[PDB]
Design a binder for these strands. Structure first.
Ligand SMILES: [Zn+2]
Ligand SMILES: [Zn+2]
Lengths: 113, 114
DNA sequence: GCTCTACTCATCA
DNA sequence: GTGATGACGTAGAG
């Protein structure tokens, strides 16, 4: 029986993380480790990691799950990305957490001026 | 036989203006009235009339002729629009020739700022 | 804590 | 006198 890669105990994987994101992780372990497994909206990815629309629209770069827009089914679909992929791309791009914060620090300044 | 709408004499229409732009205009009248019949590139339409990419990209709005990009076949194709259509849309948008010139006047100022 | 892009120019294509 | 768009961010519509 294949095991969850975090606990090595559960054998029933979370259907979203497994099927959409290709992660053999159980639902419990996913709540226990949001730092790796939380789902982020497109908008949160841009706020948190400073990724651009072109990066987040690239079908070849991230797995994504889509849902109806909660404000209205007639609006553009909500797009959910998994934190570990988004973060790994953001660290490659800005140079680790070290660099990402530099860019946070940067944007906060011009925020005033 | 049907006659050119500018001269009322010629019977063979310019192939581009007829087939692509639906104007029964002979080639000679087209050279004689560029103020209506000259063909403008996409970039020229933006420069001259302050039309935006969404307006010029709207397939339902203007007739267009496409050619190979003269800088390179591998670049984005060149797009040619006929001045009467582009001008008539621009006068509607900015308010005749008059409003258009105000927008010229306006844009030269912010240019001086920088 | 929703998404998409229009809102004047280098650069690349 | 070539075309398309991303680039300090973001309102507004959707
Ligand atoms: Zn587990
Ligand atoms: Zn004629």
């Amino acid at each position: 029986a294949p095991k969850c890669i975090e606990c090595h105990i559960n054998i029933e994987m979370d259907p979203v993380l497994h099927d959409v994101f290709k992660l053999q992780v159980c639902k419990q372990c996913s709540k226990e480790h949001p730092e790796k497994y939380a789902l982020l909206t497109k908008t949160e990815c841009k706020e948190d990691y400073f990724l651009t629309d072109p990066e987040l629209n690239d079908e070849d770069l991230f797995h994504r799950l889509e849902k109806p827009n909660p404000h209205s089914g007639t609006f553009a679909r909500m797009q959910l990305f998994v934190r570990c992929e988004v973060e790994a791309f953001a660290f490659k791009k800005w140079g680790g957490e070290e660099g990402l914060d530099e860019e946070w620090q940067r944007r906060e300044e011009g925020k005033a001026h």
